[PDB]
Amino acid sequence: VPREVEHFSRYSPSPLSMKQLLDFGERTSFAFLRQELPVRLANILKEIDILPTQLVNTSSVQLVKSWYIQSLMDLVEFHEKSPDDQKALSDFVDTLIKVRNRHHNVVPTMAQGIIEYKDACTVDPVTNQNLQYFLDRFYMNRISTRMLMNQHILIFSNPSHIGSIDPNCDVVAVVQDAFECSRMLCDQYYLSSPELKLTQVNGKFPDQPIHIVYVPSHLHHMLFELFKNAMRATVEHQLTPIEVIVVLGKEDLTIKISDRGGGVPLRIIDRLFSYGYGLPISRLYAKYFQGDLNLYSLSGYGTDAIIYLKALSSESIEKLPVFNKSAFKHYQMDWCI
Amino acid sequence: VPREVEHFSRYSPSPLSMKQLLDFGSERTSFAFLRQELPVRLANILKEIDILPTQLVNTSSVQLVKSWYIQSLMDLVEFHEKSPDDQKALSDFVDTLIKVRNRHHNVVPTMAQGIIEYKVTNQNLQYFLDRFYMNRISTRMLMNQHILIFSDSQTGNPSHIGSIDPNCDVVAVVQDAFECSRMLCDQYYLSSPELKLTQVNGKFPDQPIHIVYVPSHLHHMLFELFKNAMRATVEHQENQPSLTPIEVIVVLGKEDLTIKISDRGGGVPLRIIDRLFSYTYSTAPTPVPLAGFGYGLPISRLYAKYFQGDLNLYSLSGYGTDAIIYLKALSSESIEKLPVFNKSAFKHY
Ligand SMILES: Nc1ncnc2c1ncn2[C@@H]1O[C@H](COP(=O)(O)OP(=O)(O)O)[C@@H](O)[C@H]1O
Ligand SMILES: CNc1cccc2c1NC(=O)C2(C)C
Ligand SMILES: [Mg+2]
């Protein structure tokens, strides 16, 4: 329990809007990130310490802790530098690159610790819920720190993008690319893949191209995972084409992916988002900027996946976990069953 | 609270499966159960009625409902002394259930009238109304099962065991509920979307889709969802030369009977999706009725969840909406979802 971790964990993370992140396009981002990134690393670090001791003692969770601590300490060092020190700004970018490289394997490492703990230890129902609660928050936390760091790196280190954000993200283009990416893996494994039947409706601007401010990589990640499952279910169940509809409303950008891969019983639909990490992480990407990712399956026929994204950058605000009394109380935590 | 309410509220409701409710039609056994279970269920909800805000309980409407439930609780407790072999007690018990059923006939509109006086955002009121209406659904279910099996005059549908159709023709109920909504839609708009129905029997390919279910409950759910899909479709396409059909797919899987109702009625923002399932919430004004009362979605979801099913709405704002009903395909897993007044419920308030 280093002192810096305890200190910065007492701060609440500061969520940014997609709009703010566009404003990155160096002195201000530097002062903000040297404060905000330790805060977010410190908050999740403290939350790691309340996990079951046998999980925290796994080499994998110990690695994650050590990486996050080292990265926190690397960033806190810049609190002694001036935002006007142009070399400190340059060094700060190199440090974000180092931190990004150090965190490159966080997701599978953490996943390895969870699987090792679940496979080897008894997990009471409360603890199992807390693990899904923790992993949603841990992976959201990583998504957020990676977002903020890459935004600073990409801007101050694609030219048509502002950092990792596309101010006029061609949603349909991303859908088509993510489908093709999944289609390639599907052919490599199944030697055959369903085709894409894509419909687009722009309710906000009829007959006009659908564009929103969004992170295309995040959108690609969500769709890629949903397409992999739709294609794996379609081929194994059977090829019927995966039907996709992209809709832009006043407040929401909606993408619905539909297959006829036989579906799954409602009893098991929730297990899809238990930690098998692609779907839960995909949903985290959707919820990161106040979106959502829902699955509704028709057992015996097929499955619909619907992505909700905010159509306004001002409302696309980071959904960040905070290690405060409420979170700690959720861990401690009417109808007949 | 009378002593009987305090006493019987200490017991937890005993949920029954639809298979068990069918087995009642395979009399003293149902009498022995109901004379105890119905007071317990009335007593549980009577305790929660007191937790409501003073402005709502004191409404003549809620006080009436409370007075009805109390009297029905007392009517039923009168039978605790009788022997299940007393054939006259069994006959009188049927008469009492019919009296309680008739007394409770106007509970929902009375309770709704009470909410109108008290007046969507009240989380405790949503919590209570879910539990109150689920409680009523369950007590009406149990009483009607006994009445429709053992009464001399109330026989229900000859093909049902009580109110349960062991071979519920799901598609037929869909078509009937769609026509009922179409008739109402035509009255309000002089046009109605057509039905584009698809059925997939993954459990028994190409075979008719039947499950054990309460067709009246299924009809209510579909009727309410069709009323919403038709209204949204007509109004969203009112400047179009035609109406897109409402697409329905009925799927029978190993564990689930799934009904998806898809329209192109413009959808709704994700921001207000949760608000749609709130009582009274309606984009139409409150009537004195196709829409306006704001009970279609929440009550329909109660019916779906009453037997461990569910009802979800997934909307594409600017395009249309998917309403999906999940029902258990096996009667043994179709277990009552019942509220219980305990520390958890009290803490939730
Ligand atoms: N299929 C749908 N398409 C668009 N809006 C819907 C749909 N279903 C429900 N809604 C919205 O949810 C609200 C509540 O509906 P409901 O609970 O059935 O009661 P009511 O129909 O009286 O409003 C409606 O006012 C409507 O705006
Ligand atoms: C868009 N489709 C799907 C998206 C996610 C998960 C699934 C899908 N389809 C399936 O069968 C399973 C694997 C449940
Ligand atoms: Mg309605």
Side-chain angles (χ1 to χ4, degrees), chain A residues 2 4-26 28-324 326-328 330-332 335-336, chain B residues 2-118 121-122 124-287 289-342 344-346 348-349:
Chain A
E4 292 75 5
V5 178
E6 185 62 20
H7 172 65
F8 286 96
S9 72
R10 292 179 175 182
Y11 291 101
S12 177
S14 295
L16 300 179
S17 75
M18 192 81 69
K19 197 170 186 177
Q20 292 172 278
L21 289 163
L22 287 182
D23 300 331
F24 277 52
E26 184 169 6
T28 311
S29 300
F30 163 73
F32 173 79
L33 290 176
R34 71 176 182 181
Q35 170 69 16
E36 182 62 21
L37 293 176
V39 167
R40 300 187 183 190
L41 292 175
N43 268 257
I44 195 66
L45 280 167
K46 282 290 291 185
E47 190 162 337
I48 289 170
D49 290 327
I50 61 167
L51 289 168
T53 303
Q54 292 200 81
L55 172 56
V56 180
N57 289 343
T58 62
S59 64
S60 293
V61 178
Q62 287 295 301
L63 285 172
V64 172
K65 281 184 63 172
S66 66
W67 300 338
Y68 276 17
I69 290 169
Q70 182 63 63
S71 295
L72 183 148
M73 297 304 300
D74 297 333
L75 297 162
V76 170
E77 287 177 2
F78 286 88
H79 283 247
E80 304 182 3
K81 296 293 184 178
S82 175
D84 298 335
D85 184 337
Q86 293 185 24
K87 187 59 173 181
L89 300 174
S90 183
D91 293 352
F92 186 73
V93 181
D94 296 335
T95 292
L96 296 184
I97 292 169
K98 180 175 62 171
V99 169
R100 182 174 67 186
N101 299 338
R102 185 184 298 116
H103 294 185
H104 178 60
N105 304 119
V106 163
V107 173
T109 301
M110 173 58 70
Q112 182 59 40
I114 298 293
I115 299 167
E116 171 178 342
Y117 170 71
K118 285 186 176 182
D119 294 5
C121 308
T122 300
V123 187
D124 55 84
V126 174
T127 298
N128 197 337
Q129 292 175 353
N130 291 339
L131 289 179
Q132 185 175 356
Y133 181 75
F134 163 83
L135 288 171
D136 285 341
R137 299 162 60 81
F138 175 88
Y139 287 137
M140 190 67 87
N141 177 277
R142 157 169 177 85
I143 288 168
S144 79
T145 60
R146 183 179 174 186
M147 180 67 194
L148 270 53
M149 292 193 318
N150 292 346
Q151 197 68 3
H152 193 85
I153 295 168
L154 290 172
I155 296 171
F156 302 111
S157 176
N158 186 275
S160 300
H161 297 351
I162 300 185
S164 66
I165 300 172
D166 191 334
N168 294 267
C169 181
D170 191 327
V171 175
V172 176
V174 181
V175 173
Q176 292 176 343
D177 181 77
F179 182 91
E180 295 297 336
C181 293
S182 178
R183 199 176 183 176
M184 276 304 300
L185 181 63
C186 194
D187 294 334
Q188 290 174 350
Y189 195 87
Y190 297 102
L191 311 177
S192 181
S193 57
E195 288 187 347
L196 175 62
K197 173 178 173 57
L198 193 154
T199 299
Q200 58 179 127
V201 179
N202 189 330
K204 210 172 187 175
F205 320 102
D207 308 327
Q208 309 194 20
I210 295 174
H211 301 304
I212 58 164
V213 185
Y214 206 75
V215 186
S217 64
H218 291 194
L219 178 55
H220 190 285
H221 294 348
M222 298 177 238
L223 298 162
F224 173 74
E225 292 295 328
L226 296 176
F227 283 138
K228 279 197 299 190
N229 288 281
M231 292 180 176
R232 174 171 180 178
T234 300
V235 300
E236 292 185 359
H237 177 67
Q238 304 169 4
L239 294 174
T240 59
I242 291 170
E243 298 189 7
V244 182
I245 180 166
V246 182
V247 184
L248 177 58
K250 299 178 183 177
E251 309 179 17
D252 296 313
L253 180 287
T254 307
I255 303 167
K256 182 175 69 174
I257 303 167
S258 306
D259 67 49
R260 298 187 179 184
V264 60
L266 180 69
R267 174 182 54 83
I268 300 152
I269 205 74
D270 282 0
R271 299 183 188 175
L272 297 170
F273 294 109
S274 63
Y275 299 91
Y277 289 59
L279 288 174
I281 286 167
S282 296
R283 179 169 68 175
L284 294 179
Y285 277 112
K287 297 176 77 64
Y288 174 51
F289 285 118
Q290 302 304 320
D292 210 341
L293 193 162
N294 299 125
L295 300 176
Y296 49 113
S297 188
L298 299 79
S299 181
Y301 173 75
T303 304
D304 293 335
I306 187 162
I307 291 173
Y308 298 103
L309 305 178
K310 292 293 191 181
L312 304 173
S313 55
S314 63
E315 299 178 354
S316 301
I317 299 170
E318 286 185 294
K319 185 178 290 180
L320 298 177
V322 188
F323 189 70
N324 54 15
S326 177
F328 177 84
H330 186 289
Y331 284 95
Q332 290 188 331
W335 297 86
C336 298
Chain B
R3 288 188 308 152
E4 292 82 353
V5 178
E6 294 291 2
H7 170 64
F8 286 102
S9 71
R10 290 176 47 81
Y11 298 92
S12 172
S14 295
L16 298 185
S17 68
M18 201 150 46
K19 183 174 67 174
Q20 290 171 302
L21 289 167
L22 275 179
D23 292 356
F24 282 134
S26 177
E27 183 171 358
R28 63 176 67 88
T29 308
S30 189
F31 163 74
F33 181 76
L34 291 180
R35 73 175 179 175
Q36 181 66 15
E37 182 62 16
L38 291 173
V40 168
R41 294 189 186 186
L42 294 173
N44 270 260
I45 193 64
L46 278 168
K47 288 298 300 184
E48 293 187 37
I49 289 172
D50 292 353
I51 310 304
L52 280 175
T54 303
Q55 296 100 349
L56 177 53
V57 300
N58 292 346
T59 66
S60 58
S61 297
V62 175
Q63 285 301 313
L64 266 174
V65 174
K66 182 179 175 179
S67 72
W68 294 337
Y69 278 10
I70 286 173
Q71 184 57 61
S72 298
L73 187 150
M74 301 305 173
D75 294 343
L76 296 164
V77 172
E78 288 284 338
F79 287 87
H80 274 122
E81 64 174 1
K82 300 299 187 181
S83 173
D85 298 324
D86 179 354
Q87 293 184 5
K88 173 173 178 300
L90 299 178
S91 178
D92 299 330
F93 186 73
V94 170
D95 296 347
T96 294
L97 294 190
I98 294 170
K99 175 173 61 176
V100 171
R101 182 199 67 189
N102 295 346
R103 181 187 296 144
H104 291 183
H105 178 66
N106 301 274
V107 162
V108 177
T110 303
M111 179 59 60
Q113 179 62 20
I115 305 308
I116 294 169
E117 298 182 10
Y118 179 72
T121 56
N122 189 331
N124 285 334
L125 186 59
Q126 301 299 318
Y127 184 65
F128 166 83
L129 290 178
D130 278 338
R131 300 161 66 73
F132 176 86
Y133 289 129
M134 190 69 92
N135 176 283
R136 157 164 176 78
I137 288 166
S138 86
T139 58
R140 184 181 180 183
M141 181 68 197
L142 268 52
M143 293 190 317
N144 285 5
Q145 201 65 8
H146 187 97
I147 294 167
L148 295 176
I149 297 169
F150 301 109
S151 82
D152 297 330
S153 57
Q154 319 298 355
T155 59
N157 296 95
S159 58
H160 301 0
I161 294 172
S163 73
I164 301 168
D165 187 347
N167 318 285
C168 182
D169 187 334
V170 176
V171 170
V173 179
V174 170
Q175 292 172 334
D176 195 309
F178 191 93
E179 174 61 19
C180 290
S181 181
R182 158 158 274 179
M183 290 166 46
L184 193 61
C185 187
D186 289 348
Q187 287 184 0
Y188 278 88
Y189 301 104
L190 299 187
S191 70
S192 53
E194 293 181 337
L195 175 58
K196 184 174 180 66
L197 189 139
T198 299
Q199 46 178 120
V200 176
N201 194 331
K203 196 172 187 171
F204 313 101
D206 295 332
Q207 300 300 126
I209 292 170
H210 304 275
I211 64 165
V212 180
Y213 206 72
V214 184
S216 65
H217 294 190
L218 177 58
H219 192 279
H220 183 286
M221 291 185 285
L222 297 161
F223 176 68
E224 294 299 336
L225 294 175
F226 286 143
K227 285 202 297 171
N228 296 341
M230 292 185 177
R231 183 206 168 198
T233 298
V234 174
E235 293 184 338
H236 179 61
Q237 303 175 17
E238 61 193 5
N239 301 284
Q240 297 289 8
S242 66
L243 290 174
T244 61
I246 293 169
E247 301 182 6
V248 177
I249 180 160
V250 179
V251 184
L252 180 61
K254 294 181 67 175
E255 309 180 18
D256 304 327
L257 180 282
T258 309
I259 306 173
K260 187 172 68 177
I261 300 166
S262 299
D263 64 62
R264 299 187 213 174
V268 271
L270 184 71
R271 173 178 57 83
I272 68 167
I273 279 282
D274 296 6
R275 308 182 190 184
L276 314 186
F277 287 88
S278 300
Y279 295 95
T280 73
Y281 184 95
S282 173
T283 53
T286 311
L290 187 66
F293 285 109
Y295 277 63
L297 279 175
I299 299 296
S300 297
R301 180 169 66 183
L302 293 187
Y303 279 120
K305 299 183 77 178
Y306 173 51
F307 282 122
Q308 304 303 317
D310 209 340
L311 197 164
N312 298 280
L313 251 63
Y314 304 94
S315 192
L316 303 80
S317 183
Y319 177 75
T321 298
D322 292 336
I324 183 153
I325 294 168
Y326 297 100
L327 307 179
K328 293 296 188 187
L330 302 177
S331 63
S332 64
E333 300 181 348
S334 303
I335 298 168
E336 284 186 294
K337 173 65 79 65
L338 304 180
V340 51
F341 176 74
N342 54 21
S344 303
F346 181 78
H348 189 293
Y349 286 106

